[PDB]
C-alpha cells in the first residue's frame, strides 16, 4: 500500500548522418 | 530573378563579409545599396547568381533546440548541448546580446552555421499555466467587501502608486493565502483577480493581444505531481524562472496555486505518498531564498489551512492571509441581489402589488427569501451535535449556507418557473417558486451528514471547547 | 516537359515566393498563369527548368510524424518532439491554423523543409478513452417513473430548448448524483439517458469510466488520466454538442478527503477532479454523472452545490414496481404452459399478466414462509425482515433466470414446451437458498441507515 | 546578483555572527597563527532553528562578505568574485536517470577542490538540505537518497579529501537529517538560531525602523523634532505591547501526554520575519492614510493596531500537534504533546 517513483535507464542508440 | 540565401558570420571594414551557404563559407562583397555597418551578427542575407549581397533580414526558421550550458569568457560564444549529448560552441546572434541568459535555456541553433538565433519559451509551462479569461469581475462579487478591498490593496495598489511605496521603502507582499469553508468563494476571487489583471495589461498597456494571457500562471494543485524523480522540482523551477523573466519594473506576475490546502502534501505526513520531502523544500527555496523574486505574487486557495506546511505559511512567503466566512443576513441579501437582477421575466401578478416597480418587488422578494432561510423555526433545524461535554447544540441550515447554495436555489427557482411556463403557459417568476426551491434545496441535503465532517469543527469546537463526537439528524418524517 | 516540385514557404509584396527544393531555399516568381494571392503556406508548387512556379497542388501526404509539444505565441510556429526526443520548432501550414491543435497531437512533418502539414489521427488515444453506444431505453426501466422524469428535467430539457434558458439566463445543471441501495438500477438510468440524448439530437458523445480502472501502482498517473479524460471531453464538447461523462462506483475512489482510509492516496486525487470541474477554467457542455451506493462516503467537497448539485435517491422497488419489472422481463413471446393457454383461451397477454400478478403477490407477503432475516434493535425488539424490504431489480432478474432454468429442466424432462407458474413460485423461495449478498456482518452501514430510519440502533442480525 | 545585505543588517544575533566569522573569515585572516598551531579551518557549518529566524539572512550576508573580499583581493571582475559561492537551491541535483545526480555531485566537488588556492575559500551552501538529508531508511515513495547520501559523505571526507572548502548547510528539520552527516569532521560548527527575545526584538525593529522613514509631525511634537528619540520610544512601546502577558495575547493551550497544561502567548511564536511583516503592514496603513487624507506621516497607532491585525491573522493554524517545535518543550516536560486548543475570544 505505497506509491513508487521511477528512474529511467537510457538505452544505446546511434545513427549516421 | 532566381536567388539564394545565406547566413552572415562577420563584417569587415574592407566592405567584405563572410556568408555561409551551400554548406560552405565564402567572403563576398556587398552591393552599393546596402550598408556594411547596418548588418549585424547572426542575421540572414540574400545572395544572387553572381553572389552579391543585395538584401538583409533576420533568421526565423526551424532548428534543433539546444540546451545552453554556460557563457564563455569573451561573451560572444555560447556552449550548447543537443539531443544526443553533443556539446558544441556557437556564435551568439545580435538579439541575444532581452533578458539575461541563464543555464538550461532552450535556444534555436543551426549546426552547420553555428549560430544561436533566439530563446524558445519552455513548453512545460506555457501549454498548461495559461487559461482563458473568466467573465467574473469584482462587481459580480457581493458580501465580501472587506476581503475584496484587502486583496485589491495587496495586489493592485502597490503597483498603481509606485513612487509612494518607494518613498516609504515598501515592497508588495510576497504571498496571499485565501482560505475558508467550501462554497464561500475563493475561485471566484481568483477569477476576478485574473480578469482585472488581463484588463489592466490589454488596454492600459495595450502591448498586443494574448499578452494578458501570458500573465497569471494558473496551475491546478496535483497537476505538477508526476511519476519520476526530480520532474516536479524541474516543473517548479521552470515555472519560477518564467515568472522571474516575465516580472518587470512595476509589472506584476501572479502564480495561483489552486487547492493549496494539499500543496503536494503536508510535510512530515502522508503514509501513501512521500513526495513532500522533495517538493516542499524546492518551493520553500524558490520563494524567499538566497536570491529572491522582485515582482512575483503567489496566491493560494485552501480549504484546510492546518494541512499546509507551516514553513510556507510564515510571513515573508505567504504574507496576507485572507479568510472568507459564511455569509450572514446582510451578505446573503447582497449575494441574492447579485443574481436576482431586474432583467429576469417577472410575473405580472407579483408586480401587481408593486405597481410595476420591478426593483422594489425584487428587493421585497429577497427580503422574504432571507427571512425564510434564516428563520429560527423547527423547519430550519438541520442537525444536533454532541461533544465531549455532551451539551447537545442545534445547528440550522444557516450554518451551512453559502454563495454556491444561494446560486443553486436561484437556478432551481428559475427551472421551476420555466416548468410552470411550459405547462400552464403564464410567463414570469414567482416568490412562491423561490420558497418551493428553498424547501427542496434544504430537504435534498438530509443525507450529507456522516460520522465526521471537517470544515466546521475548527469553528464550533473553538467556542464550545470540546471536540465534536456525535452528530444526529433531528425530527424528520 | 519534365517539372520538379517544391515546398512553398511565404509570400512577398513583390509578387515573389520562397520555395524549398533540393534541400535549398530559393526566391522564385509565380507564372502569369497562376495568381500569387491564392497561394498558401506549405503548399506544394510545381517548378520548371527556368525555376518558375507554374502550378500549385495539394499538400504532401508522406514524411515523418512528430508529437506536438506546444504552439508558440506568434501563432505561426509550433514546438514538436522527434522520434529520438529531438525538438524542432517547425512552421504550421494553413490547414492547421476542427478544434485547435492540443499538445500530444501527431503532425506530419519533413525536417529538411521544416513544415507541419496534416494532423494525423491516432487509434491508440481513441482506444484509451472508450465511447460506446448505449442501447438501454427508458422502456427497459420500470418502477422509477419519477426518477426518469427528474433526470429528463435535469438533462434533456436544458438542451431541448436551450434558447429559452439563455432568454431566462439559466445555467444548465453540471452534475447529477444517483444514490441508493445496491442493485436498484443506478447504471441503467445513466445508460438510458445517454441513449435518449444520442437519439434526441438530429451527434453526442458518451464517456464511461469505471472506478478501479483509475488506480495505478505509481503516483501521478491517476491525476493525469483524469486530466486526459476531461481534455477529451472538452475537445468533444468544443463543437457545442453536449458531452456526458459517467463515473461508475465513486465509492471506491476519491472518498472523503479527511481520515477516510488510514492508508490511501485519496488526498491527492479528489482535489484534481475538483479542479477539473470548478476552477479558473470552466467546462461548458460537460455533464458529470456519478453513481454510488454509499453517498455518505463520497467527499463532501464534491457534493457541494454547484458540483453534482442534482441529487437523486433511488429506493428499493415496491410491489407495483416489482410488477413493472416483471412485466419488463416477461414478454408475450415467452413460452407458457399449455394448460394456462387453454385456461386463458389463447389470451397470452392475460395469462402472463395474471402469472406476474400471482408472482408479485407471492413475493410480498407477511406469512412466515418468506422469512429472510431476524433483526434485534437497541431496544431489544425482534422483527422479522422479509423479502419485501430487499426486492432489488437484480434479484428479480435472478428469480426470472432461475425460473427459466427450471422451465428448461422441466421441458427436457417431460417434453411439453411451456412455462409453469409453479416454476416461478418455487424460484421465489429458491432465490434466497443461495446468498445474494443481502446479508452482511454484525453492524453494516446499510443496516445502520435502516436503524436510523427506524429510530433504534440495530445490534443483532440472525439468518433465518 | 550577489545580495546587497550586509552583517550590519542582522540584529539579535551576536554570538552566531561571531561564530560564522570565526568559521570562515578568521582562518584566512590569520593563516600564520593557524599554521603555527597546526589548525585547519572547520570543514562544515550547520544552521538550524525555527523558520523565519534568519538562517538565509546569514547565508547571504556571508556570501556578500566573500564577494567583497574577493573583489578587493583578486580583481574587480564580478563573475570571478561571485564564483567562490555555490548555491544548491534544494533538490536541484535530483535527476530522472540512474546515477546522474552522483555524477553532478562529483563534478561540483572536484571543481570546488580545484578552485581553492589555500588563501581563497570555496563555499558551497546547501539551501534546505532536508530533502537530501535522510536517514537512509525513512523513505516511503522513493529511496534515491540511499544512493545520494553515500556519494556526498564520501566526497566530503575520505581517502582523498577536500582541504579548504567550507560546506554550509541550512535546515529546519534536524531530526530528518542523516546521523552520519551530523558528525564532527563533516559539520564541525552547529549554529542554532533562536527566536528573538525582547532585546533582539528591539534590535530588529531598530534595523527596520530606520530614522529616515517619514514620521508624523504630531509624533515629533512630543520630542520637539528629535527623530531618533521618537523612533526609539515608539520601538520600546511596540516591543512592550507585543511582549506583554495580557489576556488578549493568549494564543494556544497545550496539553501533553502526561497532562501538563501550558498557556502560550503570541510571543512564543515570534520571529524576525513577523516583525518585518508588522512593520510593512504599518507602513501600508500609513500610506493608505496618506492617500485618503492627503497628509503624510506614520503614527504609533498604526503599529499598535497592525500588531493586533497580524496576531489575529495568524491566530489559528494548529494541526494534530505536528512536532515542528513541540519536540523541545515536550522533552522538557517529559512526553510528547497530543492535545491543543485555540484560545480565541
Ligand atoms: N459573493 C459571493 N460569495 C460567495 N459565493 C458566490 C458569490 N458570488 C457568486 N458566488 C457563487 O459561489 C459559487 C462557488 O464559488 P467558488 O467556486 O469560488 O467556491 P470555492 O472556493 O471554489 O469552493 P471550494 O474551495 O470548496 O472548491 C460560484 O459558482 C459562484 O457562482
Ligand atoms: N427498473 C429496474 N429497477 C432496478 N433494476 C432493474 C430494472 N430493470 C432491470 N434491472 C436490473 O438491475 C440490474 C442492475 O442494473 P444497474 O447496472 O443499473 O445497477 P447496478 O450498478 O448493477 O447496481 P449496483 O450498484 O448494486 O451494482 C440489471 O442487470 C438489470 O437487469
Ligand atoms: N535579525 C533578524 N532576525 C531574524 N529575521 C530577520 C532579521 N532581520 C531581518 N529578518 C527577516 O527575516 C526573514 C527571514 O529570514 P531568512 O530568510 O534568513 O530565514 P528563512 O529562510 O525564512 O528560514 P527558513 O528557511 O527556515 O524559512 C528575512 O526576509 C528578513 O527580512
Ligand atoms: Mg475552488
Ligand atoms: Mg453499475
Ligand atoms: Mg531559508
Residue numbers in the entry:
A (entry chain G): -1 to 15
B (entry chain F): 97 to 193, 211 to 590
C (entry chain C): 97 to 193, 211 to 315, 326 to 587
D (entry chain E): 245 to 589
List sentences quoted exactly from the publication behind this structure.
Proteasomes are present in eukaryotes, archaea and Actinobacteria, including the human pathogen Mycobacterium tuberculosis, where proteasomal degradation supports persistence inside the host. In mycobacteria and other members of Actinobacteria, prokaryotic ubiquitin-like protein (Pup) serves as a degradation tag post-translationally conjugated to target proteins for their recruitment to the mycobacterial proteasome ATPase (Mpa). The bacterial 20S proteasome interacts with a ring-shaped AAA regulatory complex called the mycobacterial proteasome ATPase (Mpa) in mycobacteria or ARC (ATPase forming ring-shaped complexes) in other actinobacterial species. Here, we use single-particle cryo-electron microscopy to determine the structure of Mpa in complex with the 20S core particle at an early stage of pupylated substrate recruitment, shedding light on the mechanism of substrate translocation.
To improve the local resolution of Mpa, we performed local 3D classification and 3D refinement combined with signal subtraction of the 20S CP (see “Methods”). This approach resolved two states of Mpa at an average resolution of 3.8 Å and 3.9 Å, respectively. The two states correspond to two distinct motor conformations stalled at sequential stages of substrate translocation. Based on the visible side-chain density, this tubular EM-density can be assigned to the first 15 residues of the Mtb Pup sequence. A stacked pair of residues, the canonical aromatic pore loop residue F341 and the highly conserved adjacent lysine residue K340, forms a spiral-staircase that encircles the Pup N-terminal segment by engaging in unspecific interactions with its Cα backbone. Another channel loop about 16–17 Å further down (V384-S385-S386) forms a second spiral-staircase. It is resolved only in four of the six protomers, the other loops are flexible, as the Pup N-terminal segment has not yet reached far enough down at this state of engagement. In state A, 5 of the 6 protomers of Mpa are in the ATP-bound state with arginine fingers contributed by the neighboring subunit. The protomer with the pore loop at the bottom of the staircase (protomer 6, cyan) displays weak nucleotide density corresponding to the ADP nucleotide form. In this case, the arginine finger from the neighboring subunit is displaced and moved away from the bound nucleotide.
